[PDB]
Symmetry: C2
Subunit: 165 residues, 2 copies
Protein backbone atom coordinates (compact mmCIF):
# COMPACT_ATOMS: atom_id res chain seq x y z
CA UNK A 1 0.00 0.00 0.00
CA UNK A 2 2.97 2.28 0.65
CA UNK A 3 3.82 2.96 -3.01
CA UNK A 4 0.20 3.96 -3.63
CA UNK A 5 0.46 7.08 -1.44
CA UNK A 6 3.91 7.95 -2.68
CA UNK A 7 2.91 7.76 -6.34
CA UNK A 8 -0.38 9.56 -5.70
CA UNK A 9 1.50 12.80 -4.93
CA UNK A 10 4.91 12.18 -6.58
CA UNK A 11 6.00 14.55 -9.33
CA UNK A 12 7.04 14.17 -12.96
CA UNK A 13 10.43 12.96 -11.69
CA UNK A 14 8.77 10.32 -9.51
CA UNK A 15 10.12 12.26 -6.55
CA UNK A 16 8.31 14.16 -3.79
CA UNK A 17 9.16 17.54 -2.37
CA UNK A 18 8.51 18.36 1.29
CA UNK A 19 4.92 19.49 0.63
CA UNK A 20 4.01 16.34 -1.33
CA UNK A 21 5.77 14.18 1.23
CA UNK A 22 3.56 15.71 3.90
CA UNK A 23 0.39 14.85 1.99
CA UNK A 24 1.72 11.34 1.33
CA UNK A 25 2.60 10.59 4.95
CA UNK A 26 -0.72 11.99 6.15
CA UNK A 27 -2.85 10.22 3.54
CA UNK A 28 -0.68 7.25 4.62
CA UNK A 29 -2.22 6.85 8.06
CA UNK A 30 1.10 6.24 9.82
CA UNK A 31 0.35 9.17 12.17
CA UNK A 32 -3.35 8.51 11.87
CA UNK A 33 -3.88 8.57 15.62
CA UNK A 34 -1.46 11.30 16.61
CA UNK A 35 -0.63 14.81 15.51
CA UNK A 36 -0.05 14.89 11.75
CA UNK A 37 3.44 15.90 10.64
CA UNK A 38 4.37 19.52 9.96
CA UNK A 39 5.94 20.86 6.76
CA UNK A 40 9.08 21.69 8.73
CA UNK A 41 9.35 18.07 9.93
CA UNK A 42 8.97 16.85 6.35
CA UNK A 43 11.77 19.20 5.15
CA UNK A 44 14.19 17.70 7.67
CA UNK A 45 13.09 14.26 6.53
CA UNK A 46 14.09 14.99 2.98
CA UNK A 47 17.34 16.67 3.99
CA UNK A 48 18.27 13.61 6.04
CA UNK A 49 18.24 11.49 2.88
CA UNK A 50 19.01 14.01 0.16
CA UNK A 51 22.36 12.64 -1.08
CA UNK A 52 21.82 13.97 -4.60
CA UNK A 53 21.16 17.40 -3.01
CA UNK A 54 17.95 18.21 -4.91
CA UNK A 55 15.46 18.94 -2.15
CA UNK A 56 13.33 16.03 -3.32
CA UNK A 57 13.00 12.36 -2.46
CA UNK A 58 12.67 9.23 -4.57
CA UNK A 59 10.94 5.99 -3.62
CA UNK A 60 14.17 4.27 -2.66
CA UNK A 61 15.01 6.96 -0.11
CA UNK A 62 11.36 7.00 0.95
CA UNK A 63 11.63 3.35 1.89
CA UNK A 64 14.51 4.15 4.26
CA UNK A 65 12.41 6.96 5.76
CA UNK A 66 9.41 4.72 6.23
CA UNK A 67 11.59 2.17 7.99
CA UNK A 68 12.93 4.85 10.32
CA UNK A 69 9.49 6.31 10.98
CA UNK A 70 7.86 3.07 12.04
CA UNK A 71 10.86 2.39 14.26
CA UNK A 72 10.59 5.81 15.91
CA UNK A 73 6.81 5.40 16.25
CA UNK A 74 7.46 2.16 18.11
CA UNK A 75 9.71 3.87 20.66
CA UNK A 76 7.22 6.72 21.10
CA UNK A 77 4.56 4.21 22.04
CA UNK A 78 6.79 2.32 24.47
CA UNK A 79 7.83 5.47 26.41
CA UNK A 80 4.20 6.61 26.31
CA UNK A 81 3.52 5.12 29.78
CA UNK A 82 -0.11 6.05 29.13
CA UNK A 83 -1.77 7.36 25.99
CA UNK A 84 -2.63 10.81 24.61
CA UNK A 85 0.08 11.09 22.03
CA UNK A 86 2.38 13.26 24.09
CA UNK A 87 5.54 12.36 25.95
CA UNK A 88 7.18 13.93 28.97
CA UNK A 89 10.68 15.32 29.36
CA UNK A 90 11.89 12.19 31.13
CA UNK A 91 10.00 10.06 28.59
CA UNK A 92 11.90 11.94 25.86
CA UNK A 93 15.36 11.63 27.37
CA UNK A 94 14.75 7.88 27.58
CA UNK A 95 13.78 7.69 23.92
CA UNK A 96 17.00 9.45 22.91
CA UNK A 97 19.25 7.15 24.92
CA UNK A 98 17.26 4.36 23.34
CA UNK A 99 18.26 5.32 19.78
CA UNK A 100 21.90 4.94 20.75
CA UNK A 101 22.91 8.50 21.60
CA UNK A 102 25.04 9.14 24.67
CA UNK A 103 24.49 12.86 25.20
CA UNK A 104 25.34 14.86 28.30
CA UNK A 105 22.63 16.20 30.68
CA UNK A 106 22.99 19.82 29.53
CA UNK A 107 22.67 18.91 25.87
CA UNK A 108 19.65 16.67 26.55
CA UNK A 109 18.17 19.54 28.54
CA UNK A 110 18.65 21.95 25.65
CA UNK A 111 17.04 19.52 23.26
CA UNK A 112 13.98 19.02 25.49
CA UNK A 113 13.48 22.75 26.12
CA UNK A 114 13.54 23.16 22.33
CA UNK A 115 10.48 20.96 21.71
CA UNK A 116 8.38 21.49 24.85
CA UNK A 117 4.81 22.81 24.92
CA UNK A 118 3.63 22.76 28.52
CA UNK A 119 6.04 20.02 29.71
CA UNK A 120 4.63 18.02 26.83
CA UNK A 121 6.28 16.75 23.65
CA UNK A 122 3.87 16.04 20.81
CA UNK A 123 4.40 13.31 18.23
CA UNK A 124 5.38 15.74 15.41
CA UNK A 125 8.09 17.41 17.47
CA UNK A 126 9.28 14.03 18.68
CA UNK A 127 9.82 12.83 15.12
CA UNK A 128 11.35 16.15 14.02
CA UNK A 129 13.81 15.74 16.90
CA UNK A 130 14.70 12.15 15.85
CA UNK A 131 15.28 13.08 12.21
CA UNK A 132 17.37 16.15 13.06
CA UNK A 133 19.42 14.14 15.58
CA UNK A 134 20.41 11.70 12.83
CA UNK A 135 20.98 14.25 10.05
CA UNK A 136 23.36 16.34 12.16
CA UNK A 137 25.32 13.29 13.34
CA UNK A 138 25.76 12.05 9.76
CA UNK A 139 27.03 15.47 8.74
CA UNK A 140 29.44 15.53 11.64
CA UNK A 141 30.72 11.97 11.14
CA UNK A 142 31.60 12.74 7.54
CA UNK A 143 33.96 15.46 8.82
CA UNK A 144 35.47 13.36 11.60
CA UNK A 145 37.84 11.37 9.38
CA UNK A 146 39.56 9.55 12.25
CA UNK A 147 36.38 9.25 14.39
CA UNK A 148 37.87 11.16 17.37
CA UNK A 149 34.70 12.88 18.48
CA UNK A 150 35.97 16.17 17.07
CA UNK A 151 36.00 17.84 13.67
CA UNK A 152 37.25 20.96 11.95
CA UNK A 153 34.84 22.86 9.69
CA UNK A 154 35.46 25.64 7.25
CA UNK A 155 32.71 28.26 7.52
CA UNK A 156 31.01 27.81 4.13
CA UNK A 157 30.91 24.04 4.47
CA UNK A 158 29.58 24.35 8.05
CA UNK A 159 26.77 26.66 6.85
CA UNK A 160 25.74 24.63 3.85
CA UNK A 161 25.26 21.52 5.96
CA UNK A 162 23.38 23.12 8.88
CA UNK A 163 21.21 25.43 6.80
CA UNK A 164 20.09 22.39 4.80
CA UNK A 165 18.91 20.64 7.94
CA UNK B 1 2.86 50.46 21.16
CA UNK B 2 5.49 47.70 20.83
CA UNK B 3 5.58 46.99 24.58
CA UNK B 4 1.79 46.67 24.65
CA UNK B 5 1.77 43.53 22.47
CA UNK B 6 4.76 42.09 24.30
CA UNK B 7 3.23 42.50 27.76
CA UNK B 8 -0.22 41.34 26.60
CA UNK B 9 1.18 37.85 26.11
CA UNK B 10 4.25 37.91 28.35
CA UNK B 11 4.47 35.42 31.22
CA UNK B 12 4.92 35.72 34.99
CA UNK B 13 8.62 36.21 34.27
CA UNK B 14 7.91 39.07 31.88
CA UNK B 15 9.33 36.80 29.18
CA UNK B 16 7.64 35.20 26.18
CA UNK B 17 8.10 31.66 24.92
CA UNK B 18 7.91 30.77 21.22
CA UNK B 19 4.13 30.37 21.32
CA UNK B 20 3.48 33.74 23.01
CA UNK B 21 6.04 35.45 20.79
CA UNK B 22 4.04 34.24 17.77
CA UNK B 23 0.84 35.74 19.19
CA UNK B 24 2.65 38.98 20.00
CA UNK B 25 4.27 39.42 16.57
CA UNK B 26 0.98 38.59 14.85
CA UNK B 27 -1.16 40.82 17.06
CA UNK B 28 1.64 43.29 16.35
CA UNK B 29 0.82 43.84 12.69
CA UNK B 30 4.42 43.81 11.44
CA UNK B 31 3.51 41.04 8.97
CA UNK B 32 2.24 43.62 6.51
CA UNK B 33 0.32 42.03 3.61
CA UNK B 34 2.66 39.05 3.85
CA UNK B 35 2.08 35.69 5.53
CA UNK B 36 1.96 35.35 9.37
CA UNK B 37 4.98 33.86 11.15
CA UNK B 38 5.03 30.14 12.02
CA UNK B 39 5.87 28.61 15.44
CA UNK B 40 9.04 27.16 13.95
CA UNK B 41 10.17 30.65 12.85
CA UNK B 42 9.45 32.03 16.31
CA UNK B 43 11.55 29.31 18.00
CA UNK B 44 14.61 30.17 15.93
CA UNK B 45 13.97 33.81 16.81
CA UNK B 46 14.22 33.06 20.48
CA UNK B 47 17.22 30.74 20.06
CA UNK B 48 19.02 33.50 18.16
CA UNK B 49 18.86 35.71 21.25
CA UNK B 50 18.69 33.17 24.08
CA UNK B 51 21.98 34.00 25.86
CA UNK B 52 20.68 32.91 29.26
CA UNK B 53 19.62 29.63 27.60
CA UNK B 54 16.05 29.51 28.94
CA UNK B 55 13.97 29.10 25.81
CA UNK B 56 12.25 32.39 26.56
CA UNK B 57 12.70 36.03 25.62
CA UNK B 58 12.72 39.24 27.68
CA UNK B 59 11.78 42.69 26.40
CA UNK B 60 15.42 43.75 26.04
CA UNK B 61 16.13 40.89 23.65
CA UNK B 62 12.77 41.47 21.99
CA UNK B 63 13.89 44.99 21.11
CA UNK B 64 16.89 43.53 19.24
CA UNK B 65 14.61 41.12 17.38
CA UNK B 66 12.20 43.88 16.46
CA UNK B 67 15.09 45.88 15.06
CA UNK B 68 16.23 42.95 12.95
CA UNK B 69 12.71 42.11 11.74
CA UNK B 70 11.99 45.62 10.50
CA UNK B 71 15.34 45.55 8.75
CA UNK B 72 14.68 42.17 7.12
CA UNK B 73 11.18 43.27 6.09
CA UNK B 74 12.73 46.30 4.38
CA UNK B 75 15.02 44.10 2.28
CA UNK B 76 12.17 41.77 1.40
CA UNK B 77 10.17 44.67 0.02
CA UNK B 78 13.11 46.04 -1.96
CA UNK B 79 13.80 42.73 -3.70
CA UNK B 80 10.12 42.19 -4.32
CA UNK B 81 10.16 43.87 -7.75
CA UNK B 82 6.45 42.96 -8.04
CA UNK B 83 4.32 43.12 -4.87
CA UNK B 84 3.75 39.35 -4.89
CA UNK B 85 4.60 39.03 -1.21
CA UNK B 86 6.71 36.10 -2.30
CA UNK B 87 10.26 36.36 -3.63
CA UNK B 88 12.03 34.33 -6.23
CA UNK B 89 15.27 32.36 -6.12
CA UNK B 90 17.28 35.19 -7.63
CA UNK B 91 15.44 37.74 -5.46
CA UNK B 92 16.46 35.59 -2.50
CA UNK B 93 20.16 35.23 -3.33
CA UNK B 94 20.17 39.00 -3.73
CA UNK B 95 18.77 39.55 -0.21
CA UNK B 96 21.38 37.21 1.30
CA UNK B 97 24.31 39.01 -0.29
CA UNK B 98 22.62 42.14 0.94
CA UNK B 99 22.83 41.17 4.61
CA UNK B 100 26.59 40.85 4.25
CA UNK B 101 27.04 37.14 3.53
CA UNK B 102 29.49 36.00 0.86
CA UNK B 103 28.33 32.44 0.33
CA UNK B 104 29.34 30.20 -2.56
CA UNK B 105 26.86 29.29 -5.36
CA UNK B 106 26.33 25.70 -4.12
CA UNK B 107 25.60 26.84 -0.57
CA UNK B 108 23.17 29.52 -1.80
CA UNK B 109 21.50 26.92 -4.00
CA UNK B 110 21.09 24.54 -1.06
CA UNK B 111 19.57 27.33 1.04
CA UNK B 112 17.08 28.28 -1.70
CA UNK B 113 16.04 24.67 -2.36
CA UNK B 114 15.36 24.37 1.37
CA UNK B 115 12.67 27.09 1.48
CA UNK B 116 11.11 26.95 -1.98
CA UNK B 117 7.51 26.25 -2.98
CA UNK B 118 7.30 26.02 -6.78
CA UNK B 119 9.96 28.63 -7.21
CA UNK B 120 8.47 30.92 -4.62
CA UNK B 121 9.73 31.94 -1.19
CA UNK B 122 7.07 33.21 1.23
CA UNK B 123 7.70 35.87 3.83
CA UNK B 124 7.68 33.42 6.77
CA UNK B 125 10.34 31.15 5.26
CA UNK B 126 12.34 34.21 4.20
CA UNK B 127 12.49 35.47 7.79
CA UNK B 128 13.12 31.97 9.14
CA UNK B 129 16.09 31.83 6.75
CA UNK B 130 17.51 35.21 7.86
CA UNK B 131 17.21 34.30 11.55
CA UNK B 132 18.85 30.92 11.10
CA UNK B 133 21.64 32.43 8.95
CA UNK B 134 22.64 34.73 11.81
CA UNK B 135 22.19 32.21 14.68
CA UNK B 136 24.49 29.67 13.00
CA UNK B 137 27.14 32.29 12.17
CA UNK B 138 27.14 33.53 15.77
CA UNK B 139 27.65 29.96 16.97
CA UNK B 140 30.47 29.44 14.48
CA UNK B 141 32.20 32.73 15.27
CA UNK B 142 32.27 31.82 18.95
CA UNK B 143 34.34 28.74 18.12
CA UNK B 144 36.62 30.49 15.60
CA UNK B 145 38.92 32.06 18.19
CA UNK B 146 41.41 33.50 15.69
CA UNK B 147 38.81 34.26 13.01
CA UNK B 148 40.37 32.07 10.32
CA UNK B 149 37.16 30.79 8.72
CA UNK B 150 37.51 27.38 10.32
CA UNK B 151 36.81 25.87 13.73
CA UNK B 152 37.05 22.62 15.63
CA UNK B 153 33.96 21.29 17.41
CA UNK B 154 33.63 18.57 20.00
CA UNK B 155 30.56 16.50 19.14
CA UNK B 156 28.43 17.27 22.22
CA UNK B 157 29.10 21.02 21.89
CA UNK B 158 28.31 20.83 18.16
CA UNK B 159 24.93 19.12 18.84
CA UNK B 160 23.89 21.43 21.67
CA UNK B 161 24.32 24.51 19.47
CA UNK B 162 22.70 23.17 16.28
CA UNK B 163 19.79 21.36 17.96
CA UNK B 164 18.93 24.60 19.76
CA UNK B 165 18.67 26.43 16.42
CA1 LIG C 1 8.44 38.60 -6.37
Amino acid sequence: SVYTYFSAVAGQDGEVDAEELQRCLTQSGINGTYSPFSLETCRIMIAMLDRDHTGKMGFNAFKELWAALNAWKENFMTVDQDGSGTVEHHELRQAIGLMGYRLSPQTLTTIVKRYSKNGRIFFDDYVACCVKLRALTDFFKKRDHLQQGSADFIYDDFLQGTMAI
